Amino acid sequence: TLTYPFHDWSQELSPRYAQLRASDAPVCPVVSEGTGDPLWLVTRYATAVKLLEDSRFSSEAAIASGAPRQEPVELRAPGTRADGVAMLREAGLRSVLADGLGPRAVRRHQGWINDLAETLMSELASREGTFDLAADFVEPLSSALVSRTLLGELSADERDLLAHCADTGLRFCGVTHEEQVHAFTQMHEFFLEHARRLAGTPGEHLLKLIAEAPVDQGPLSDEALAEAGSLLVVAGFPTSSGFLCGALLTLLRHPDAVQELHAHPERVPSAVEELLRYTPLSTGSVKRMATEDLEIDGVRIKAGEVVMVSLEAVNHDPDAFEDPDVFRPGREGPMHFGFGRGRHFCPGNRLARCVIEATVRAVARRPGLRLAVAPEEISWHEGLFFRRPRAIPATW
Ligand code: HEM
Ligand SMILES: O=C1N[C@@H](Cc2c[nH]c3ccccc23)C(=O)N2CCC[C@@H]12
Ligand SMILES: O=C1N[C@@H](Cc2c[nH]c3ccccc23)C(=O)N2CCC[C@@H]12
Ligand SMILES: [Mg+2]
Secondary structure, eight states: OOEEOOOOOSSSOOHHHHHHHTSSSSSEEEEETTTOOEEEEEOOHHHHHHHHTOTTEEHHHHHSTTOOOSSSSOSSOTTOOOOHHHHHHHHTOTTHHHHHHSHHHHHHHHHHHHHHHHHHHHHHHHOSSOEEHIIIIIHHHHHHHIIIIIIOOOOHHHHHHHHHHHHHHSBSSSSOHHHHHHHHHHHHHHHHHHHHHHHHSSSOOHHHHHHTSOOSSSSOOHHHHHHHHHHHHHHHHHHHHHHHHHHHHHHHTOHHHHHHHHHOGGGHHHHHHHHHHHSOOBSSOEEEEESSSEEETTEEEOTTOEEEEOHHHHHTOTTTSSSTTSOOTTOOOSOOOTTOOGGGSOTTHHHHHHHHHHHHHHHHTSTTOEESSOGGGOOBOSSBSBOOBSOOEEEO
């Protein structure tokens, strides 16, 4: 019956999420608009915990070529595996993510990240007119994050190529299927040519750490490095840029909350966590394949079927959060789902929280920052997996 996704490309969540959440069944059938595949959809917090903590519902099997899927094309250059995390597991490197992405990486990078956030915001505060927080703040900050922490030194042309491929490939619609496949082919061909060199540029970026990691087999090949490059782009680039843009819109809409953060900087970490709950990001869902015949809260799922969890729907579940549609940094609720749950909890969470915190603090230190247009005049890219406005006109 209901086709998926729900076309809610702005920060207004589709009403279909609450409608399914309040239905009797804890899992609801939908149909992929792009493929016609039947899919299951979970929208309730309690059910999502149980599903995402169950290793019998496999992420790798839902990523694999040939799986039923919500996305209109396979997210891979044809003929490639295109599962960088599985590649790291086969290589024995799952721990290298911790070194390049965990608290050790945050210690290494937090200083320059905050220096850059303040440098960008201070320059905007010096301008005699308006500016665009998306292009003038989020783009340089997120580009620096990807280069310095993930890929290595990138030229502006290389950064633009990778950003184009991410925006073209990671879509439910708005491009033809052939252009979407070509975006992944373009990015894979870029990394086949350049991943080795990038891994050798100065810095402690994750791609270097992967290339230099001790492996029981040989040190990783150029093909393995290329798989890692595409993973890091799709997981790190449009997510960070979309989230930072959305978080800025949330802050600009809540001046009373920003004033409290200005007066009490020790409350910023709680506001970061509330932004991760409140600010929607993906227009799709995390998903898992049943590896055998299973039951989730009484509903039978056959082996090979795919079950989706909308993190936005879970983060807005009123059985978990009181007044879920209110931005409330003081909130004393359960853990949010903005980074997922269980064994697949975002390994980028530490670096993401550091860049989000640096952005929140840069805003909170300078009262009066506001939208320069009406909030309904904000224009959205339509069809991206990871929501992003076309521009955020702003001023003091
Ligand atoms: C605000 C920014 C970000 C958000 C909201 C976010 C969110 C998430 C979420 C919800 C998942 C779970 C997907 C699932 O359960 O299938 C995930 C996984 C992942 N994230 Fe992040 N992420 C962000 C930034 C980053 C960054 C900067 C990196 C750097 C490489 C990264 C790397 C990854 C990887 C590799 C995975 C896959 C983990 C797995 O499948 O086991 N993320 N992210
Ligand atoms: O490591 C993975 N995990 C899941 C979730 C995901 C996390 N970040 C993503 C970015 C875009 C699409 C999906 C995801 C996935 O679907 N994957 C294919 C591309 C990255 C790979
Ligand atoms: O929109 C998507 N979201 C991720 C999961 C995710 C949900 N929220 C996230 C936030 C950050 C990274 C990944 C996710 C995913 O698996 N996808 C397969 C095709 C569509 C694509
Ligand atoms: Mg199949």
